[PDB]
Amino acid sequence: NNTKAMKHALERVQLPWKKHSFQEHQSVTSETNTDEHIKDIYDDTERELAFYKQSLDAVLVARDELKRLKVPFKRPLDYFAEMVKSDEHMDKIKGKLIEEASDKKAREEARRQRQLKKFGKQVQNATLQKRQLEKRETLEKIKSL
């Protein structure tokens, strides 16, 4: 595996990015980070965080570079175009999220209605006792004079 072949291939393929504005390149090399600091890639959780950080570094670099240039960065949200995910896909995802929320609400109601039914008689008795005690206290205070 001689490096000369790929070196010659690069000599023809490599473009003079350094001699042109970063807008043409539109690529950020997140160097200085060897990506060896990922804790237990096999955990399936730290790998995602490492990729998120590596992408955030490039995002910040691109934001700074494009702010150096005059190309707008933020989407005004007033420009409507063909989103990669069709409106049907977004509606389906919203429906899935609503289904998850409904499941959470159903669990909350299942963990409250049974207790309310069980304590309904106790709640009524406690309320009646409290009201009667308040009435007796008021009557005694009136009679105390």
């Binding site: 001689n2 200085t32 707008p72 990669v84």
Partner: protein
């Protein structure tokens, strides 16, 4: 300044998951051309010439389990074969994506890309192959999604994330995600001596 085009070709046997992956790749890349099928290998270069296309992506598959990908410059450039194993399609509801179709992508390459000449070669190939030209016919002005590439354990991982703001920015994972290995590198487009072999 930068101007590039990509040709998408899929051989018989591409399952619906791989077909959806190719379709969403063609949507993320606005300078992409799609072809019906391919049968047999050097003919691929002619197809790119018919469209004056500067790049070609071929999704080979020996069996309908393991996807394979070829990235090359059709005229006389080298080609690299990727043995993709993991694959997540664009039709997954776990990721919420409002990315503009064909908008400018932002790349993210770690230091491993510069650690070897062939790593640099693949980095450049991804940069110009996946980097939409600023003045592409079907591109879009605003920037809404970014592309993340990280290589660990000798294989390159591909991730994509959408950007978001608030009333200072945040991003959420979008698009397909998979892992690609380096199998074989050829000096020429679908030919020549085998420079590198794992």
């Amino acid at each position: 300044m930068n101007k590039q085009r990509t040709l998408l070709i899929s051989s018989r046997g591409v399952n619906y998951r791989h077909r959806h992956l190719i379709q969403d790749l063609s949507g993320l890349l606005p300078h992409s051309r799609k072809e019906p099928k391919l049968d047999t290998l050097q003919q691929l270069n002619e197809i790119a010439e018919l469209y004056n296309c500067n790049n070609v992506l071929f999704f080979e598959a020996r069996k309908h389990q393991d996807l394979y990908l070829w990235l090359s410059k059709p005229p006389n450039g080298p080609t690299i074969k990727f043995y993709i194993q993991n694959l997540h399609t664009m039709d997954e509801l776990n990721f919420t994506g409002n990315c503009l179709k064909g908008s400018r992508p932002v790349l993210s390459f770690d230091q491993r890309f510069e650690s070897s000449p062939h790593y640099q070669l693949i980095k450049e190939l991804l940069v110009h192959n996946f980097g939409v030209p600023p003045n592409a016919r079907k591109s879009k002005p605003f920037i809404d999604h970014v592309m993340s590439f990280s290589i660990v354990d000798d294989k390159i991982w591909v991730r994509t994330y959408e950007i978001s703001h608030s009333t200072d920015i945040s991003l959420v994972e979008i698009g397909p995600r998979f892992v690609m290995t380096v199998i074989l590198i050829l000096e020429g487009s679908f030919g020549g001596p085998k420079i590198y072999e794992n």
